Amino acid sequence: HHHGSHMESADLRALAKHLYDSYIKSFPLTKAKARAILTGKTTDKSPFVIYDMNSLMMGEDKIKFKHITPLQEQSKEVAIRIFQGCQFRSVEAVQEITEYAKSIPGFVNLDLNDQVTLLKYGVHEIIYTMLASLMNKDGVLISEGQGFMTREFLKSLRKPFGDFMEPKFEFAVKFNALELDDSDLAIFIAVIILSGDRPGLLNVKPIEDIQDNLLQALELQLKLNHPESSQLFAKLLQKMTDLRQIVTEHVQLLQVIKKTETDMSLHPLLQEIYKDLY
Ligand SMILES: Cc1c(C)n(Cc2cccc(OC(C)(C)C(=O)O)c2)c2ccc(C(=O)N[C@@H](C)c3ccc(C(C)(C)C)cc3)cc12
Ligand SMILES: Cc1c(C)n(Cc2cccc(OC(C)(C)C(=O)O)c2)c2ccc(C(=O)N[C@@H](C)c3ccc(C(C)(C)C)cc3)cc12
Predict the structure, then answer these.
(1) What's the domain count of the chain?
(2) Terminal CA-to-CA distance of the chain, rounded, Å?
(3) In this structure, what CATH number is given to the domain that contains residue 258?
(4) What residues are paired with 62 via a beta bridge?
(5) Mind telling me where the Glycyl lysine isopeptide (Lys-Gly) (interchain with G-Cter in ubiquitin) cross-link is?
(6) What's the domain range around 38?
(7) Strand ranges of the sheet holding 139-142, from the earlier edge strand across to the other edge
(8) 158 in ligand 1 pocket by Cβ < 6 Å?
(9) Which helix (H) or strand (E) holds 142?
(10) How far apart, in whole angstroms, are the C-alpha atoms of residue 266 and residue 76?
(11) Which among 255, 256, 252, 233 is positioned nearest to 244, based on CA atoms?
């Protein structure tokens, strides 16, 4: 309706500053930095770009690990290698999202199982959201922004994998047009985590009490940060529901990979070895 300046908004603004500070510490590559890389507006070096098989073969030579596994199915060798690469990064994203989730005021004091339930269902939606920060119309920044894989190259992968990243790109172009910065995304991520309608929650009301404060802080943030924007808060609420129906089709997609590959779930001990050596 109208804005007041009455210590209540001062608390909502302080919560946004607190969420932004934790957001910066939890995630190294911010959207503000990712946008600087995508437009060259950075004194740092340009990332390596993978746009075909030659540039991918040239990019594989820059990695210390080898992983030959010589076989006849080289089209699946490349597709599996790329899929296992982003799979590994997803694990690193979870512990970063969990780190940020701990910093949301009140999250740690919740039931320990509900913290797992909120993260179990919310991690996929946050990765879906933060993936848009690394994308433009051409491709996506990968590996701490040191690599850039084009959208059409990912599109050309073998039958099941050529459609894995496409729904994410189609979401990113619609989501990036909202022009949210890191300050907006910090509260938007916190609202996604504290969703009281996750299946199997125990104490729903304490979760909604936290989210209502985050929803108020977000609305105050969007109206201040985006003066030339109309109904941006309602647009973000719809984008959350868009994630739910599109992330279930995402988990149904990779469950096919979990079965039609007959050996895709990376062994937990071997995956831990790659983590501890790097
Ligand atoms: C060496 C290697 C290993 C061991 N894995 C894990 C792994 C793969 C495949 C199956 C797998 O699981 C089973 C089947 C069990 C197994 O065989 O071990 C496990 C990789 C994943 C991706 C890439 C890569 O090259 N990724 C591309 C996208 C890129 C990204 C970034 C760059 C920079 C350096 C330019 C930033 C270059 C190239 C290389 C590797
Ligand atoms: C295809 C792809 C995407 C879309 N991404 C970004 C990404 C994915 C998942 C969540 C995620 O989340 C957010 C929050 C958006 C974020 O991180 O920004 C961001 C990648 C990152 C790295 C690699 C890779 O292939 N990297 C090579 C260099 C490697 C990896 C691992 C190995 C081991 C297994 C041998 C250790 C070797 C080589 C591939 C991808």
Answers:
(1) 1
(2) 52
(3) 1.10.565.10
(4) none
(5) 25
(6) 1-278
(7) 48-50, 147-150, 139-142
(8) no
(9) strand 139-142
(10) 16
(11) 252
